[PDB]
Design a protein around this motif. Structure first.
Motif, PDB file in Angstrom:
ATOM      1  N   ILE A  89       1.451   0.609  -8.016  1.00  0.00           N
ATOM      2  CA  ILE A  89       1.034   1.999  -8.439  1.00  0.00           C
ATOM      3  C   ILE A  89       1.743   2.456  -9.440  1.00  0.00           C
ATOM      4  N   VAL A  99      -8.120   1.326  -2.779  1.00  0.00           N
ATOM      5  CA  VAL A  99      -7.347   0.590  -1.917  1.00  0.00           C
ATOM      6  C   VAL A  99      -7.867  -0.383  -0.851  1.00  0.00           C
ATOM      7  N   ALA A 111      -0.170   3.589  -0.245  1.00  0.00           N
ATOM      8  CA  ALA A 111      -0.760   4.226  -1.672  1.00  0.00           C
ATOM      9  C   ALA A 111      -0.675   5.560  -1.633  1.00  0.00           C
TER      10      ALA A 111
END
Lengths: 293, 293, 293, 293
Positions: C30, C43, C65
């Protein structure tokens, strides 16, 4: 009426190595088919390379077959195309040299509507007083004559059947169930023909029967007599042939096969090509397994 | 060598009521195309009903187009087919009446191998000293000339480009990236042509340009100059036309459209048929919306 | 509302050797995406192996995330499926751990009608107050959400766009022209995304961007600014990657590629399998050629 | 060993109007099937809406069938999916409530390789000591288990057959010919099942048998006894049913049919929808013609 039933090879057009017609080989092939039990022949159809013959060569092939067959079996002449006027003219020639019927493919390439397909075939049937067998092979034509259109044409005088090459056994059952008594359903798909015939169809217009005419005649005879066990035993024996004779586009493999069997020379006309070297052992094994080599 | 670039209508073949040629309407159409900005014409291609013309009619159409154009724009003659020797003869005839190039379709119906396709086109280029534009349309031919085969033929003297009707924009980019400098990539798919040209292709051999030649000439001009905004504004205005000109198989709808525009009569040859009455409202609506009616 | 525009990798789910999650590698990925110019992430979409994650693993990936992105870029959670009640539950979970939107695939396998698809997505949007991006990929689902159904759902509060993986550039232009102002059209087909964006679309939800996020961010930036020349030069450089990242079903090749790049380990969950050894040379060659290796 | 042969309805999951399970209707349906001659039942397969049941509801349906059948006929539980671990867990449940076997679909949506399909099924067979019938339906899964992969799995202990929904009668003959003696070939395609069985297959796992269990049992009995005439007469009578029970995606039409017959309520779960009004008269006519209404 002409009665066309059972095993009908779509016979190759034998050629000399330079592509010229090999009529001597063709005559011998016809005699071989008749003694092996073949019921009728389709001459200069797709398997006979109609695309690459001149009109003179096309008509000479039909006449040769008619003369040599000597009425021992029916001769059906491929005579269709994607032009209605050209199909009419070819049908007139086929009649004039004594063909018993024409085989008429659905127009390829120009993608007519269902009504255009109907009017095409209806105009051919009306213009030439000779029986017509329709031929649906969307895998080559793109245009696909629906069952509904096929059954409309079954009502047109002169149109006596259809060669269905789809291998779609649902569609074949629908046609068999709905077809008028005078109207014959022939397979155009060797791998499924046994099923079409067991369900009530009338014959198989065949590639495999080019190399195994006796076996294919026995398979058709049994399937049409509702004898599953006999028909399926033969079918299973020919299964690898039904497959590998299309390892490249028909008639590329079946002509190489007949050359290996000693029945024809190697000629084949561009844009078709002799069977790829890489495919030879696969087709050879299928022929040796079938006892043909 | 000849420069074929931009908007290239695949021009219809005007016919009278019985299908007979209408050369007077054809000449007027050619003049209108030149006035409106058309860059070149493909004559007696698929949209020109090559399948139902005699050789003499085919040649007369080319000759009429060459004479009437009077070198103001290039004339590309459709001259291909599924027989290598027949394609050579037609190409000879096209050269003899002054065509600037031929458009050569991949063989339909008999399904040649990739090497068969290679040998077919190579034989045609070698036999007649006139440029060749290849034409891949698997939606009509079934056989699909792979990019690998196309790029091999780009090495053959005389083969100057390809018309790619797949609408496959990945395949188009692949051809554009790998093509040698002399070898042009043209769209054969009006709905995606803008993308093919913006990615670096060279023109659009077009159905829609039959009815909107000025707009399509401006679309191609903008797309080839990397002017997205201008090209896409024109494209979006024509979007419904790109669709409804195929509501039935081309050239059925576009011939009906040109008749509604007063530019041709209604002749069309079986197995093709006049546009189904059920489609008229939809097609006319697209014409009217695009300011053509 | 949330603005999702530009290059949006469908990020893989890093796993350890037994398939267990590898959140440490995921966080590093990320950060790399953000440094390289990625605009947002999807995601646990298809590329994230949603099919083989438990609900708890699915939610943990989204939560990881969201937390790690720390609002620097939007996080879109894959949360769809072929059960309407299950998609609602997953969407609830995605909202609860801070996703900015969900990505909702058309139901696979059970083949709903168009009205079934409409009712499915409408129920999902109404049940969870979080934006929805629709996802049409008939190459995986069989069911195909028509443009008519898509544009009806564009009228439903909360439905902010669609990912169109068809690669059908005609269909893309149709959606772009008819879409309301609030409704974004994203590519789901890396080989054609450049064309979708140049025609007026809004971004590319991408496999290739997993390995070339900087190049894909620059491609999208240029295409969305109508800069054909810059966008197409990047596109052509990545053309082989767009192809060979699908040499086996996504995400098999791209997970192998990221492992060769040192960014993840080799875990992947059955029925998916590590990239076939026979493909390694080809895929690595595309990576090396693109300057990624 | 469990012997599964003949007519095997893929029985619907009866639901109350609000979608809740209707176990009372389900029990009555099971008794009706047994008295009408049904040979086995597949419970909570595709026709049983496995996609939209919870795990608790899925297992409750299997247990209900097992308890009510009371060993009078075999009960096969649908228990597959596109996650190997989920299919293992569902198979454990099916074993625990006394199912005689599981039916295991090829993974949908995530498109595993042939080796991934092999390892998926092999892991399921090894993890749970209960027989496995494979299910290939590429028309819903996209992934297509090749004959070669199928025959590799025939060598894995526990894997006792395959339901082939392709309707590809060539492929069925190939499987029948090559299959080991312990390995059964079942049709998953009502329109062609008669042919698969006449060629040597072992049964039909059926939609049509939901509404015509006695007829379908007689058709299977005759086809398996090589009695073409009896089987084809029944088949032709059911031809419109075989077609119109798929007028929308199975099980939408067959559930509406059973509601018209008074055997179930109207419940069906999104994203599936009640049969479109426009289709009702077509399905009603097929049922009245079959004597069911």
């Amino acid at each position: 009426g002409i009665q066309i039933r059972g095993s009908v090879p779509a016979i190759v057009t034998p050629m000399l190595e330079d592509g010229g017609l090999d009529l001597a080989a063709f005559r011998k092939l016809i005699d071989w088919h008749i003694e092996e039990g073949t019921d009728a022949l389709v001459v200069v159809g797709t398997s006979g390379e109609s695309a690459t013959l001149s009109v003179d060569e096309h008509v000479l092939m039909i006449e040769t077959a008619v003369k040599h067959a000597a009425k021992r079996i029916p001769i059906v002449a491929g005579a269709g195309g994607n032009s209605t006027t050209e199909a009419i003219e070819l049908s007139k020639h086929a009649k004039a040299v004594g063909a018993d019927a024409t085989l008429q493919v659905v127009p390829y390439y120009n993608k007519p509507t269902q009504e255009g397909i109907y009017r095409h075939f209806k105009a051919i049937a009306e213009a030439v007083d000779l029986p017509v067998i329709l031929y649906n092979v969307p895998g080559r034509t793109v245009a696909d004559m629906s069952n509904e259109t096929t059954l409309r044409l079954a009502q047109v005088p002169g149109i006596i059947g259809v060669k269905d090459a789809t291998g779609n056994i649902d569609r074949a059952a629908q046609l068999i169930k709905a077809a008028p008594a005078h109207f014959s359903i022939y397979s155009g798909d060797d791998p499924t023909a046994i099923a079409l015939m067991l369900l009530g169809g009338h014959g198989n217009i065949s590639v495999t029967a080019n190399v195994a005419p006796r076996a294919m005649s026995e398979l058709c005879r049994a399937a049409l007599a509702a004898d599953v066990k006999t028909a399926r035993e033969i079918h299973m024996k020919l299964l690898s042939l039904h497959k590998h004779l299309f390892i490249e586009a028909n008639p590329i493999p079946v002509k190489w096969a007949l050359q290996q069997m000693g029945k024809i020379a190697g000629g084949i006309r561009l844009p078709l090509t002799p069977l790829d070297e890489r495919c030879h052992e696969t087709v050879r094994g299928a022929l040796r397994e079938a006892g043909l080599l």
